[PDB]
Symmetry: C3
Subunit: 289 residues, 3 copies
């Protein structure tokens, strides 16, 4: 089953993208539930809705918010994805991941991946920010992987490693910075595990997920990271912790992400600022030092 | 990948169903290996084979037993599914689950799901009845989920919860009743884990299944329960324990479910009676108390 | 979803195979990364490239090495598969497994399955040979199983067991023989777990894989074994251990299988010799004793 997308298809989409924007971004950022809020911060912002870009997986049903805004965020030139794509939505992983491949041909060397997890480690408060340090791809344990097909050496190897996925440096460099800004609560670090399907994890499941030694759980970020690294992109990311998964038999109270009122607002604002002062710590190709 | 079934398709099938039967059931029951034996108990029984109902996933190869019999079981009006459908049989989960959606439009508020598991908890005898208390969907950990596609708000939310799947009340109300009837052996309670594929679990696998903290294992009941709850149906179910999965290196004796002689007969008879005196404990919409 | 291959399709391919070769093999061997090296050992060797056999899944992109050579190895008549097929390559499991079914109709009663794993047990050196003793099919935990469809009683049952997969005798008979030849290092024994997708296991993943109690990991050998046993073939196999999966945060050195220089040569040579003196321990249909 090869990818319905042929190399010329990306070429095409990059080019296009590169003939409609005087902008050459060095960083792609992927925005997650209640986090497209970061696109307000850009400067020289230039917005293109998927619908409009030649082969772009167009968005489904949930709302009018999902487009590609180019701009300037603190010194570095970025591309930002508002509204990503998930497996639950019906998309083959060669669709969720398409963006990353074009970003490659734009000329992006770094990618920050945001998301809003469920925490599973008993020391996490809704509000927390977790530096993804690692992942657990269950979907991939079974062949649900974006690199599943004939390989495209123009993209990468056949068997890329992942010990290594989320940069040690941008991870040290992130840790330091939370010093810098001198924040209240701590900037967690843990493993991120993915789970596909839309319904939520029951309680035996929350317990497997936790015995597997995961700290947050969600329905995104691993496909995109894998094919990001396949391509040699520098990857680092964070998780906004919204829920706090029940590992005991009880009457859940909970019902939202950010919908309620400050749930995503409050905690989402701090990561948006964090991500924004981090642009500064990301090496600049012109390594003219 | 949306569901090959469009809302009008259910509408159609319900209607039909509702213009061929003077019966309006308030309970659907799903019968599992060696348990269609319950349809003998109905009264005012009205039988319709799948083949005959407009979009109904028609049955495969194993035998002539698989149809939909409406009737009367102890006071409540039920619909009973003799011979369910599995993933191993080749069916997308939007096929295994179709029935549940029509039951929805029939006007069913409750669903009991029977099945015959393998026990994995070292205190279970073949014969036992386990109240499923919870589940572990491995198939779904990877995107094999029935809610995988664009959502149908007429059916439900996008991200339904499952902490909650198997009613606390019908579960207390079941526990009590085994008192009532005053039975010999005890009515177990545990977690039910699903596994797709037809071949049986080897011995390292039986051990993962058990470390994951499951108590019974099978190849059904989770899809149907998930989309049952998606729809706000009251769900409760049981497992008949037929085998007793080997977690040590040895020469299995075993070879059947019920095929042998009383294997499914004996133990299947008690659950059929149990299910039958439970109709009485299920609330009656006319809540005229 | 039935198998795109209909019984007449195998018939056809066997026949063909059986009208182009005066050879009737009693053993199929499946060769794995850096192990087609065994075909040099045959005698009366007769080579047929996939491309050429009527329905044979033809090979992809990686190189010119992948064909079916019949011959004579120590007394027994074998068929040897140079270059197997994987899920990562894009193949439905009814494609990876096709070969096994024809071997069935050739008249093969035994199958040895080679492969080159990653070791996960902390006592294994790259170089080691592990007698697969058992398996963990994650792909199958989710419905990615070769027996997924309508059953073909001419092939087998519906629900075949696997406690039993890798022969106790050929396993004792193998153990003894490493005595016989009197080898330096020991002939390991452990559980083999499969994982699909091409990229490599990160470090939380290596830890799940190991908590699941696996000892080696790879991207082959379980489909083929399952449908081999479905068919009542005697199965036994080995793993060549090439890597030594990182279960700690560190800077991997590693980069190859056999590519480097003696990595696959050295260790691959010993298994090829081992497999070769084992032909002698495999019962001979003419049981004229």
């Amino acid at each position: 089953m090869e990818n319905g997308y042929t190399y010329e298809d990306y070429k095409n989409t990059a080019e296009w993208l590169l003939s409609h924007t005087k902008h050459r971004p060095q960083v792609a950022i992927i925005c997650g539930s209640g986090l497209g809020g970061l696109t307000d911060k850009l400067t020289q912002a230039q917005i293109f809705d998927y619908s409009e870009i030649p082969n772009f997986p167009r968005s489904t049903v949930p709302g009018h918010a999902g487009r590609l805004v180019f701009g300037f965020l603190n010194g570095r030139a970025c591309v930002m994805m508002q509204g990503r794509f998930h497996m639950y939505e019906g998309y083959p992983l060669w669709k969720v991941t398409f963006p990353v491949r074009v970003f490659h041909l734009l000329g992006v060397d770094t990618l920050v991946v945001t998301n809003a997890a469920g925490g599973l480690n008993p020391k996490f408060e809704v509000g927390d920010i977790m530096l993804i340090r690692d992942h657990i791809n269950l979907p991939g344990f079974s062949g649900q992987n974006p690199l599943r097909g004939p390989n495209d050496e123009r993209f990468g190897d056949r068997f890329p490693a992942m010990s290594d996925a989320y940069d040690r440096t941008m991870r040290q460099r992130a840790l330091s910075t939370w010093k810098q800004m001198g924040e209240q609560r701590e900037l967690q670090e843990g493993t991120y595990v993915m789970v596909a399907g839309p319904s939520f994890e029951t309680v035996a499941e929350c317990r497997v997920l936790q015995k597997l030694g995961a700290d947050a759980v969600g329905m995104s970020t691993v496909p995109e990271v894998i094919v990001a690294r396949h391509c040699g992109l520098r990857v680092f990311g964070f998780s906004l912790i919204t829920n706090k998964v029940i590992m005991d038999y009880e009457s859940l109270e909970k019902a939202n992400h950010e919908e309620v009122l400050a749930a995503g607002k409050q905690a989402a604002q701090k990561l948006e600022q964090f991500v924004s002062i981090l642009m500064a710590s990301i090496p600049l190709p012109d390594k003219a030092s």
